[PDB]
Scaffold this active site. Sequence first.
Site, PDB file in Angstrom:
ATOM      1  CG  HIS B  41     -12.978   0.731   1.705  1.00 24.19           C
ATOM      2  ND1 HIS B  41     -12.936  -0.555   1.443  1.00 24.19           N
ATOM      3  CD2 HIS B  41     -11.779   1.370   1.512  1.00 24.19           C
ATOM      4  CE1 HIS B  41     -11.803  -0.564   1.713  1.00 24.19           C
ATOM      5  NE2 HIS B  41     -11.099   0.382   1.758  1.00 24.19           N
ATOM      6  N   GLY B 143      -7.347  -7.752   1.305  1.00 16.51           N
ATOM      7  CA  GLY B 143      -7.504  -7.679   2.741  1.00 16.51           C
ATOM      8  C   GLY B 143      -6.342  -7.106   3.718  1.00 16.51           C
ATOM      9  CB  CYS B 145      -8.367  -2.218   3.171  1.00 10.70           C
ATOM     10  SG  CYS B 145      -8.327  -2.321   1.203  1.00 10.70           S
TER      11      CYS B 145
HETATM   12  O1  LIG Z   1      -9.390  -3.314  -8.357  1.00  9.54           O
HETATM   13  C1  LIG Z   1      -9.153  -3.503  -7.428  1.00  9.54           C
HETATM   14  C2  LIG Z   1     -10.324  -4.155  -6.189  1.00  9.54           C
HETATM   15  N1  LIG Z   1     -10.793  -2.867  -5.255  1.00  9.54           N
HETATM   16  C3  LIG Z   1     -10.943  -3.316  -3.966  1.00  9.54           C
HETATM   17  C4  LIG Z   1     -10.323  -2.327  -2.729  1.00  9.54           C
HETATM   18  C5  LIG Z   1      -8.624  -2.346  -3.298  1.00  9.54           C
HETATM   19  O2  LIG Z   1      -8.097  -1.757  -3.942  1.00  9.54           O
HETATM   20  N2  LIG Z   1      -8.028  -3.344  -2.402  1.00  9.54           N
HETATM   21  C6  LIG Z   1      -6.668  -3.597  -2.086  1.00  9.54           C
HETATM   22  C7  LIG Z   1      -5.741  -2.942  -1.759  1.00  9.54           C
HETATM   23  N3  LIG Z   1      -4.388  -3.050  -1.676  1.00  9.54           N
HETATM   24  C8  LIG Z   1      -3.976  -3.923  -2.562  1.00  9.54           C
HETATM   25  C9  LIG Z   1      -4.907  -4.675  -3.037  1.00  9.54           C
HETATM   26  C10 LIG Z   1      -4.184  -5.959  -4.282  1.00  9.54           C
HETATM   27  C11 LIG Z   1      -5.169  -6.591  -4.926  1.00  9.54           C
HETATM   28  C12 LIG Z   1      -6.518  -6.632  -4.798  1.00  9.54           C
HETATM   29  C13 LIG Z   1      -6.949  -5.337  -3.939  1.00  9.54           C
HETATM   30  C14 LIG Z   1      -6.341  -4.717  -3.149  1.00  9.54           C
HETATM   31  C15 LIG Z   1     -10.795  -0.958  -3.503  1.00  9.54           C
HETATM   32  C16 LIG Z   1     -10.709   0.034  -2.206  1.00  9.54           C
HETATM   33  C17 LIG Z   1     -11.106   1.449  -2.603  1.00  9.54           C
HETATM   34 CL1  LIG Z   1     -11.099   2.693  -1.542  1.00  9.54          CL
HETATM   35  C18 LIG Z   1     -11.322   1.868  -4.187  1.00  9.54           C
HETATM   36  C19 LIG Z   1     -11.260   0.843  -5.030  1.00  9.54           C
HETATM   37  C20 LIG Z   1     -11.026  -0.555  -4.560  1.00  9.54           C
HETATM   38  C21 LIG Z   1     -10.876  -1.599  -5.571  1.00  9.54           C
HETATM   39  O3  LIG Z   1     -11.111  -1.169  -6.810  1.00  9.54           O
HETATM   40  N4  LIG Z   1      -8.112  -3.160  -6.914  1.00  9.54           N
HETATM   41  C22 LIG Z   1      -6.846  -3.709  -7.282  1.00  9.54           C
HETATM   42  C23 LIG Z   1      -6.300  -3.089  -8.690  1.00  9.54           C
HETATM   43  O4  LIG Z   1      -5.995  -4.353  -8.982  1.00  9.54           O
HETATM   44  C24 LIG Z   1      -6.702  -4.810  -7.940  1.00  9.54           C
END
Ligand SMILES: O=C(CN1C[C@@H](C(=O)Nc2cncc3ccccc23)c2cc(Cl)ccc2C1=O)NC1COC1
Lengths: 296, 305
Positions: B41, B143, B145
Amino acid sequence: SGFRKMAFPSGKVEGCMVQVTCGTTTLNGLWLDDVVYCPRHVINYEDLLIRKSNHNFLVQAGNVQLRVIGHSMQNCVLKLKVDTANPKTPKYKFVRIQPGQTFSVLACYNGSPSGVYQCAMRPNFTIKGSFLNGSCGSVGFNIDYDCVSFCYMHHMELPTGVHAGTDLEGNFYGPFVDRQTAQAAGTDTTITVNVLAWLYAAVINGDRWFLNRFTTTLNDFNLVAMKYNYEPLTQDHVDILGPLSAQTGIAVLDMCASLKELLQNGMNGRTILGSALLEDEFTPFDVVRQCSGVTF
Amino acid sequence: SGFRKMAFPSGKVEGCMVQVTCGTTTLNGLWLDDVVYCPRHVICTSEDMLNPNYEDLLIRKSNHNFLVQAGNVQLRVIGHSMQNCVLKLKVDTANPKTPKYKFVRIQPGQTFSVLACYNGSPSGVYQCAMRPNFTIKGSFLNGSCGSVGFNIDYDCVSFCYMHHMELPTGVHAGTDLEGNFYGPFVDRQTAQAAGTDTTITVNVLAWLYAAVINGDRWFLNRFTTTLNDFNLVAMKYNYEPLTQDHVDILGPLSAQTGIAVLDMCASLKELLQNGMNGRTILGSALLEDEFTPFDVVRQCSGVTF
Ligand SMILES: O=C(CN1C[C@@H](C(=O)Nc2cncc3ccccc23)c2cc(Cl)ccc2C1=O)NC1COC1
Ligand SMILES: [Cl-]
């Protein structure tokens, strides 16, 4: 999201761990530059030390044998001068911590690291660690940017299962001595400023069931804290909690009224950050660091 | 004496963490030999996250679109390929700090250490378990990831997890190092939710044996149970079913303490019924399930108090 008991990355400390053997005793040593630091009990300590020569001390760094060229004592720590400086020596300081402050421990056996965990210096100067025979000389530390601050060296286990040790200058934390004698940990207390910090961390992660509309005076809070074996809360503690109070909108004395209510009523089948007990091994700085993303 | 949630020393993993940048996105990568592994991603915009066609996004990229940073040095990308949900970036320098390693896929109930990283820099290490619902209860911020989960047995690092996302409840989802997700999750911003979580029964039993080893027996009783009767009770408290494999795995701890697995199962039944009554077990007021039978044998003494 999430809240775990997090330790610092141990890499810079792993590159300093060595095995020290004197006669039948084997424990861990910290190799920094051309000196190996280890508990003096590896050997009247001055009378025992004068009878030893450099070759009596066997120092092993991985698969290499280090040659001891000198030895001296500083309080309860033995300093072994070796022929080779450690090429993996990081930027470091020796610092003495205060009760309530937290640190990481790299538990070792035979100069080999086996695990890393986070803990706090209790008000009674003991640490609730996880140590077995051979762990002596394992060290406690923090990291500020790129500098490792060594604050603890393990020396012994007390009859209640808790641990005692020294700073890296050989001064014990607590009224303990390095010998087999009748020694007991004093009655322990809860680190109040840390519990408050952890209640702020719960609010940051969206757990607010314990909040109320009330406030308290500092004196009234401490009268209740003295009743529940909680450490007194000082004006310094209140000042230190300032940034967390501004971030969440809950004044420190406002959060003290929540803690007063939790002390008199309990949790009522509820948890805070996945715990049924009030957690006191996270400092105000640990909460800010884990809920910010500080790297090394 | 003592019993802590212990993580493995992170040194061998720290020497593999790098920062990967593609356009406006920045996350962590694992540099092993001449390959950098990171979540695919990284090639997405936040818009693309709803219905991303990764193959269509990847074909539009060239090697020089990917920026890889190892400390203060910029690594040169000479190739790229996708394997499931992981992107593999071939670099021109092999990592001199590459430890002995394996990629292993774990099962729910297994524990591992996580080295949480931001911008290719490690910030902390913690221990956790793969939940029965395939999520992990981690501590991750934006960040993080590409942060990895691992075990170190002997001097070989077994990589088992790479962080990909956070679910609406604050729990975390990710893949093995071959890019296969744990759980029914996708690397899409789709309305997906973690299934109802359950307690890892074999781990709670292991931890009750660890309490007996450290000298605590207040919770034992004079009863035994059948495996079926135990499961009929435990499933009412949202506990995972205990299988014959779990009973076999608890054999060495049963022999060390002298308490049969079905007698330990009878104390667990009673603990669920009565609660703790102001008492604790190994310093905890809840029944702990993130220590495996293997972790207990590793951390606790061979001689029972
Ligand atoms: O909403 C989102 C934003 N966000 C970006 C990213 C993601 O989840 N990143 C993150 C990882 N680990 C901890 C985190 C803590 C706070 C913010 C982002 C985080 C993503 C990756 C993938 Cl594969 C699918 C969807 C998403 C996706 O939704 N995620 C969370 C739910 O509350 C904030
Ligand atoms: Cl497994």
